[PDB]
Each structure stands twice: as structure tokens, then as C-alpha cells.
Amino acid sequence: GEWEIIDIGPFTQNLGKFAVDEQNKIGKYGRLTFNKVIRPSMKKTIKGYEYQLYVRASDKLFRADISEDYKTRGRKLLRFNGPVPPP
């Protein structure tokens, strides 16, 4: 596919909420509270999309990679790591 910078509107914020909810199921960083997705957010095409976000949760910053299937709209958290340096 092709990588691009995308906005941080509702769609993108919800991807960040998803990432935190999925992290919380795994419990890797304990139970986090989604704050916000900050810039920059990146998207690639895959049949679907891959998203790489900076996610603020419980006042710390994480990087999350999320995939989304085009036809079903089903999502997967691929990676959730941090804390990371600010962009």
C-alpha cells in the first residue's frame, strides 16, 4: 500500500480508544484510561488498512499499531508499546 499522514478527528480518536481497550484486555500496562490520539497519525493500505498512532493514556504516551479489515471493519491491535518519547 502507501503510507500517509491522516487527521486526528473522531475516526482516528476511536482507533486510539480501541487500542487502549484492547491493551486493557491483555493487561500489559495494567488498566489504562484513553486520553487522546495526538499528531502525527499514519495510515497505510494493506485488503484493509494499517494505522500507527501515538496514544496518550493515563497521562503517558504509547505507540500503537492497529489493522482494520476493509470489508468487515474488524480491527486488531498489533502492537502497543511505551512509554515513548513525544513527537
Side-chain angles (χ1 to χ4, degrees):
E2 281 87 8
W3 285 95
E4 53 178 351
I5 296 175
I6 59 163
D7 69 48
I8 59 161
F11 179 88
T12 300
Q13 298 296 328
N14 192 69
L15 285 165
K17 183 199 200 99
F18 167 80
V20 171
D21 287 337
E22 296 300 293
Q23 186 303 130
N24 288 346
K25 293 166 178 182
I26 296 161
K28 172 180 186 188
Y29 295 108
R31 193 172 189 71
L32 302 176
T33 294
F34 174 71
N35 307 147
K36 187 196 161 41
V37 176
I38 66 167
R39 292 182 192 78
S41 303
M42 274 189 279
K43 182 184 177 179
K44 190 197 177 174
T45 57
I46 292 164
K47 181 55 187 179
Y49 305 104
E50 180 158 332
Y51 305 93
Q52 177 153 97
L53 303 182
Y54 280 100
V55 183
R56 190 179 295 131
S58 298
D59 214 29
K60 298 171 202 64
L61 196 64
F62 298 92
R63 215 168 26 239
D65 297 342
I66 298 157
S67 68
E68 181 177 353
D69 182 71
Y70 179 75
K71 289 184 74 68
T72 69
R73 307 186 183 174
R75 296 181 170 168
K76 294 196 220 171
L77 180 62
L78 303 183
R79 288 206 350 110
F80 194 99
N81 185 77
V84 295

